Design a binder for these strands. Structure first.
Ligand SMILES: Nc1ncnc2c1ncn2[C@@H]1O[C@H](COP(=O)(O)OP(=O)(O)OP(=O)(O)O)[C@@H](O)[C@H]1O
Ligand SMILES: [Mg+2]
Length: 149
DNA sequence: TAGTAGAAGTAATAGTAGGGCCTGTGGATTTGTGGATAAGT
């Protein structure tokens, strides 16, 4: 969890890249909770629920954006609860990002809130001056431009 | 043949006629009072 524009999607894209590079047989899936809900509901409407479960319960690593989007949605929260349960039971990896810690996500069931706190919860804070300059240096060097200090 | 469990929903107008009056200074205004003035005798 952390602020916006703070590096969470970068971090877990890096996780996916690392896992794919070191293990090519792994089925690493990354998406956003918005796309999760859209696919879930469309599968319900088109009788594709079995295929949705097949695609999402059997991934080796799962990466979720902005799980805050699930707040206020009951059935999608239940379906993600069951997906989490199946993946954790199969000893698979689940990575979740958010902008708020799970304690203060409204309209969240206590089972999901306790599952979120089960593992390790990490926070991102706004960068300071040295790392701002270092980030800009990295972007400038990757792009290929020379710019004064 | 006897048959299931289903969600996440928006950006919204134009709008009425209205009570006397108990009080109460401020100031015009419309005259009476007095003064100025022509005349005529
Ligand atoms: N050390 C760093 N820390 C944070 N951000 C960094 C760092 N180095 C580079 N960035 C850049 O920060 C930007 C922030 O975008 P990012 O996708 O990470 O946002 P976010 O806060 O995780 O949001 P979201 O989950 O909605 O995508 C990226 O474009 C990334 O390239
Ligand atoms: Mg992004």
């Amino acid at each position: 969890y952390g602020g916006v524009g703070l590096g969470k999607t970068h971090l877990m894209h890096a996780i996916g890249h690392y896992v794919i590079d070191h293990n090519p047989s792994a089925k690493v899936v990354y998406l956003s909770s918005e796309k999760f809900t859209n696919e879930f509901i469309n599968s319900i409407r088109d009788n594709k629920a079995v295929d949705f479960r097949n695609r999402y319960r059997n991934v080796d690593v799962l990466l979720i954006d902005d799980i805050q989007f699930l707040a206020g949605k009951e059935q999608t929260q239940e379906e993600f609860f069951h997906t989490f349960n199946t993946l954790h039971e199969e000893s698979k990896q689940i990575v979740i990002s958010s902008d708020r810690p799970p304690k203060e996500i409204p309209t969240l069931e206590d089972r999901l809130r306790s599952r979120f706190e089960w593992g390790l919860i990490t926070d991102i804070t706004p960068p300071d001056l040295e790392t701002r300059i270092a980030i800009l240096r990295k972007k400038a060097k990757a792009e290929g431009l020379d710019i004064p200090n």
